[PDB]
Swiss-Prot record:
GO terms for biological process: adaptive immune response; angiogenesis; cell migration; cellular response to cAMP; dendritic cell chemotaxis; endocytosis; G protein-coupled receptor signaling pathway; hepatocyte apoptotic process. Activated by both the alpha and the beta-gamma G proteins following stimulation of G protein-coupled receptors (GPCRs). Activation by GPCRs is assisted by the regulatory subunits (PIK3R5 or PIK3R6) leading to the translocation from the cytosol to the plasma membrane and to kinase activation. Inhibited by AS-604850 and AS-605240. Its EC number is 2.7.1.137, 2.7.1.153, 2.7.1.154, 2.7.11.1. This is Phosphatidylinositol 4,5-bisphosphate 3-kinase catalytic subunit gamma isoform. It comes from Homo sapiens (Human). Changing R710P: Abolishes protein and lipid kinase activity. Does not abolish interaction with GRK2. CDD domains: C2_PI3K_class_I_gamma, PI3Ka_I, PI3Kc_IB_gamma. One of its GO terms (molecular function) is 1-phosphatidylinositol-4,5-bisphosphate 3-kinase activity. It is found in: Cytoplasm; Cell membrane. Residues 165-298 form the C2 PI3K-type domain. Residues 566-572 are annotated as: G-loop. Candidate target in therapy for inflammatory diseases. Selective inhibitors and protein ablation are anti-inflammatory in multiple disease models such as asthma, rheumatoid arthritis, allergy, systemic lupus erythematosus, airway inflammation, lung injury and pancreatitis. Gene3D superfamilies: 3.10.20.770, C2 domain, Phosphatidylinositol 3-/4-kinase, catalytic domain, Phosphatidylinositol 3-kinase Catalytic Subunit, Chain A, domain 4, Phosphatidylinositol 3-kinase, accessory domain (PIK).
Length: 839
């Protein structure tokens, strides 16, 4: 090809990884998966509606919450429509479709300021933009526009069976080789299914020289026929009690159902328990620095494909139901497992048993797996059950290495409306890390949902890009998936993405480079160089405009160079501000972005995403808690962008402005800072109200996530009362932050109970118990968040935190008093922890 000369090179610049490269493989799975994904791409590319894809209307089908109906004025909402200069307002009823607004005099209603549209056979109350304008209390400003051309979305034209082998499995350990290094070393070969170790053998310990040869056949007790698809040969290196130093993996049954054979020279990863990177089929690309193991597999041999009780004692049925009932983090004993397995079919009638049930399968037995597959072909009850994401997630996590088990989870995700895919996208993307193969139902599901929706597609991109840039363990796989998406998203977005990448690489350089200029307190000279470079950048590199990666509605244009700065901070982040590229954007507010190196923002992304989830949980119960989960995209290695939240300062700086440094903390400061930012009493008390919700939200949220105890230049408030935590990329005590200054805004002091503080407790306990009505879901998101986002060798102990936090097994009454105890610890401690942070 001759125009693939541009296209492929263009794809590599957009992906941030050369997909075609085969220097770091030992088989052809990645290349296979590229080819295997063409079909699911062609299928979505071809079946999606050209025009709806072009306008990507962002819509929901949940009920309009109680808090937003109470904001409707006599079943009528106002919409302002703009032509040239002149515009006029129109009365509308929540049920009005855009078409039923068009004939009210071919064009299309575009939102003012944004690349957001109000088109399609859904009521106007069902568009998120409208729901946003009610949320904050804004008028809906639209523009009579001609619909964008689908031609721009155009997509460029593109011999013996296994269950007959009764011989025991064995692998030759030839030896190991470190290029550069006084103890001893041995090799541990685990046959793994999920996190479960089926069989384990060791070499005898040898002296640890830069080369160690064993030449030994490690014979296993598991038969070849007893190997299940998705089994991992996990080779590990310990030294000497012992210590794990290098790990590496190899699928025993490969992507064409063939049993793995022959000579392998695999490069291994170092160490710096439950951790997604520990499961990777990827080899270490650093050939020169890293340790490698040499092995031999020999005996082709292929794995094939296949083609009742329900009357139990009382004591037994209950014991089963007690097991089904326990949380996702509860250990199943041998007794538990044997019980679930025997009552297989009774258990199948309970969708909630599924995780626990398929955790009872002895995957090291061919016949058992067969019975399991029999069982899965009988899933009417499952197939009929209403979607449960908490349940669906549990089956996609690290404890399930089975294509068919995982398929049934992805089956349920199929029914998510595009709104919920956005809510779970990040976590789903991360769950790809648990998939035993590069091609899987989960990867294809993300592929096609991404292709069907420019919004899911846009974030999909950034999420895969984020990992490709900083995970050697999973860049190859994500790269394959992203290339797949890119070859289907259509020229328009490829042009968008291209612009987006260029801009952020221009700016990352200006961050990299500026950071270097400062001895750790802003220099006078650094202002010269920054403002020079930002002018020197706008001259001949920055485009007329680019999409804001954390908000793809918003196009950013020229820089507000005058307003750009670098914080008095040790990580020297950039404070950039951009004019909106949209003339129709009847704002004047800039678009504010922070660029920061030094922090791992993948951790922020994860926590922020969880917060958006807690929000929608609250929505199901008609609660609003006015969390502020600001946009934040990680783009590379310890570097990314952060939404600047307009009119907001930190609690600490409010303490630093009235009292000064060495914080002799005063209580009245916040309340009269608020007062002094409020114009009227009306807008003041609304701001105090917003604070009661804001505070309680972040109280409940931070405690549950165990990130509650915080230094308070990490808590921010808007001039309109909105409290919100920031910089999550960090982590005697305190459950969450509820200081005398917050309490005084509520109207309390030391030991009292104002009208608002009662409401605070009321709102708290409601929020806390609402979360508990999704215990299972939060537990799994938290587990998954730890395993894929926080490198820490994260243990059971780390994860068991949220069990306690959400007081599992406890009744509603008992937990309400648990949470109220928490509040009272904060009441009791006052300024102690805050003061203690200082040093
Ligand atoms: C709090 C604050 C502030 C700040 C703003 C108002 C009052 N006091 C401090 N200014 C900054 C200016 C910069 F150029 C860079 C960073 C900050 C900054 N930080 C520090 C840090 C940890 C990098 C950070 C992380 C998130 C945020 N956000 C602030 C914008 O709101 C969304 C998130 C700010 C800051």
């Amino acid at each position: 090809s001759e125009e693939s000369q541009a296209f492929q090179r263009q794809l590599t610049a957009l992906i941030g990884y050369d997909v075609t490269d085969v220097s770091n493989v030992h088989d052809d799975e990645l290349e296979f998966t590229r080819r295997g994904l063409v079909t699911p791409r062609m299928a979505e590319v071809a079946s999606r509606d050209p025009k709806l894809y072009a306008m990507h209307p962002w819509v929901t089908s949940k009920p309009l919450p109680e808090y937003l109906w109470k904001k409707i004025a006599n079943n009528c909402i106002f919409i302002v429509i703009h032509r040239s200069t002149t515009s006029q307002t129109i009365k509308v009823s929540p049920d009005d479709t855009p078409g039923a607004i068009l004939q009210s005099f071919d064009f299309v209603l575009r939102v003012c300021g944004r690349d957001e549209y109000l088109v399609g056979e859904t009521p106007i109350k069902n568009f998120q933009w409208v729901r946003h304008c009610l949320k904050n209390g804004e008028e809906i400003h639209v523009v009579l526009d001609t619909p964008p051309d689908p031609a721009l979305d155009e997509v460029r034209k593109e011999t013996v069976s296994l269950w007959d082998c009764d011989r025991k499995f064995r692998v030759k350990i030839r030896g190991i080789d470190i290029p550069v290094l006084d103890l001893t070393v041995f090799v541990e070969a685990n046959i793994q299914h999920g996190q479960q170790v089926l069989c384990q053998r060791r070499t005898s310990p040898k002296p640890f020289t830069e080369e160690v040869l064993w030449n030994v056949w490690l014979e296993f007790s598991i038969k070849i026929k007893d190997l299940p698809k998705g089994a991992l040969l996990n080779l590990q290196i310990y030294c000497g009690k012992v210590q794990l130093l290098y790990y590496v993996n190899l699928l025993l049954i490969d992507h064409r159902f063939l049993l793995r054979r022959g000579e392998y020279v695999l490069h291994m990863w170092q160490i710096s328990s439950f951790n997604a990177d520990k499961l990777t089929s990827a080899t270490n690309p650093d050939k020169e620095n890293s340790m490698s193991i040499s092995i031999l597999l020999d005996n082709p041999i292929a794995l094939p494909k296949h083609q009742v009780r329900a009357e139990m004692p009382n004591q037994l049925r209950k014991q089963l139901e007690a097991i089904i009932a326990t949380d996702p983090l509860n250990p199943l004993t041998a007794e538990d497992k044997e019980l679930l397995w025997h009552f297989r079919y009774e258990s199948l009638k309970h969708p909630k048993a599924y995780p626990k049930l398929f955790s009872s399968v002895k995957w090291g037995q061919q016949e058992i797996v067969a019975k399991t597959y029999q069982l899965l072909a009988r899933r009417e009850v499952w197939d009929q059950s209403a979607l449960d994401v908490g349940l669906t997630m549990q089956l996609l996590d690290c404890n399930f290495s089975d294509e068919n088990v995982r398929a049934i989870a992805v089956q349920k995700l199929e029914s998510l409306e595009d709104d919920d895919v956005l809510h779970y996208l990040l976590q789903l993307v991360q769950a790809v890390k648990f998939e035993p193969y590069h091609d899987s139902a989960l990867a294809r599901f993300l592929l096609k949902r991404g292709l069907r929706n420019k919004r899911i597609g846009h974030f999909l991109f950034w999420f895969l890009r984020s990992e490709i840039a900083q995970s050697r363990h999973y860049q190859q796989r994500f790269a394959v998936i992203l290339e797949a998406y890119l070859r289907g998203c259509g020229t328009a977005m490829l042009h968008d993405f291209t612009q987006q990448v260029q801009v952020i690489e221009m700016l990352q350089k200006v961050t990299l480079d500026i950071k270097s200029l400062s001895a750790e307190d802003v220099s006078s000279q650094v202002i010269s160089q920054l403002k020079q470079k930002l002018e020197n950048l706008q001259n001949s590199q920055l485009p007329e405009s680019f999409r804001v990666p954390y908000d793809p509605g918003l196009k950013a244009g020229a820089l507000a160079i005058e307003k750009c700065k670098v914080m008095a901070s040790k990580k020297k982040p950039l404070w950039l501000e951009f004019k909106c590229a949209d003339p129709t954007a009847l704002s004047n507010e800039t678009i504010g972005i922070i660029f920061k190196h030094g922090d791992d923002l993948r951790q922020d992304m994860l926590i922020l995403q969880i917060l958006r989830i807690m929000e929608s949980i609250w929505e199901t119960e008609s609660l609003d808690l006015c969390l502020l989960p600001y946009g934040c995209i990680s783009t590379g290695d310890k570097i990314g962008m952060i939404e600047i939240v307009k009119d907001a300062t930190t609690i600490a700086k409010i303490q630093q402005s009235t009292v000064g440094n060495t914080g002799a903390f005063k209580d009245e400061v916040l309340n009269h800072w608020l007062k002094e930012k409020s114009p009227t009493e009306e807008k003041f008390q609304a701001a105090v109200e917003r604070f009661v919700y804001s505070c309680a939200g972040y109280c409940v949220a931070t405690f549950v996530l165990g990130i509650g105890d915080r230094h308070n230049d990490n808590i921010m408030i808007t001039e309109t009362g909105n409290l919100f935590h920031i910089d999550f990329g960090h982590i005697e005590r305190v459950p969450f932050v509820l200081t005398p200054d917050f309490l005084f805004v509520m109207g309390t002091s030391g030991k009292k109970t104002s009208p608002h503080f009662q409401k605070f407790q009321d709102i708290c306990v409601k929020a806390y118990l609402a979360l508990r009505h999704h215990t299972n879901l939060l537990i799994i998101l938290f587990s998954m968040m730890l395993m894929t986002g926080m490198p820490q060798l994260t243990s059971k102990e780390d994860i068991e935190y949220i069990r306690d936090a959400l007081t599992v097994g406890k009744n509603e009454e008992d937990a309400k008093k648990y949470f109220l105890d928490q509040i009272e610890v904060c009441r009791d401690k006052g300024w102690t922890v805050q003061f203690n942070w200082f040093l």
